[PDB]
């Protein structure tokens, strides 16, 4: 009947962006909405 | 519970102890009030 409550020991989403050598945030498009519409069409043409 | 119950017991005992001591003083003062209400060598040494 001896029970000890377990100790709660302590990679954030922000650090995932910088995990590569480059900063993933720094290479993005101006209009992501336009991009998705164009990628889907071009994929269908290919 | 645990250690905290034991600490509670000690404080309660001290609190109970204080009540008994205070009541003794009140009893004694009442006695003094009631008491107040109701050889040549020794006199020379009464001051000592």
């Amino acid at each position: 009947e001896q029970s000890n409550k377990q100790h709660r020991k302590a990679n954030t989403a922000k650090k995932k962006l910088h995990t590569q050598g480059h900063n993933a945030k720094a290479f993005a498009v101006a209009a992501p909405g336009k991009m998705a519409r164009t990628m889907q069409r071009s994929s269908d043409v290919n | 519970s645990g250690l905290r119950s034991f600490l509670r017991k000690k404080t309660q005992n001290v609190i109970d102890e204080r009540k008994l001591r205070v009541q003794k003083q009140l009893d004694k003062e009442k006695n003094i009030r009631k008491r107040n209400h109701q050889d040549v060598i020794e006199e020379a040494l009464s001051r000592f």
């Binding site: 009947e1 001896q2 | 645990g2 250690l3 034991f6």
Partner: protein, 108 residues
């Protein structure tokens, strides 16, 4: 010790008192020391009575000072169980060993 227990010293001729402190077993301080005393006593004093009944002794737990009254072999048995509790053994595990020795005590 209780008076009726103390009378056993007059009645019998081979009862002794063993005495030792918590600091002798282990240097416990602050809350650690206070928890150790509670571990020896147990909830409602049950752990202390379990040792007393098993080993045929009487124990007085005066702060960090432990006194054990009983026969020479008996007080040593009680001392070991108390010391295990001080070293940190949970009461339940000590209770099991008390049942084992308590069984042996009857057959002999």
């Amino acid at each position: 010790f209780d008076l009726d227990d103390s009378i056993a010293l007059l009645r019998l001729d081979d009862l002794y008192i063993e005495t030792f402190e918590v600091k002798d077993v282990k240097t416990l301080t602050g809350d650690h020391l206070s928890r150790a005393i509670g571990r020896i006593a147990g909830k409602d004093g049950k752990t202390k009575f379990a040792i007393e009944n098993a080993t045929r002794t009487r124990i007085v737990l005066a702060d960090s000072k432990i006194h054990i009254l009983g026969g020479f072999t008996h007080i040593r048995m009680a001392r070991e169980s108390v010391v295990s509790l001080i070293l940190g053994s949970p009461p339940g595990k000590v209770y099991g060993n008390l049942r084992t020795v308590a069984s042996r005590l009857k057959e002999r």
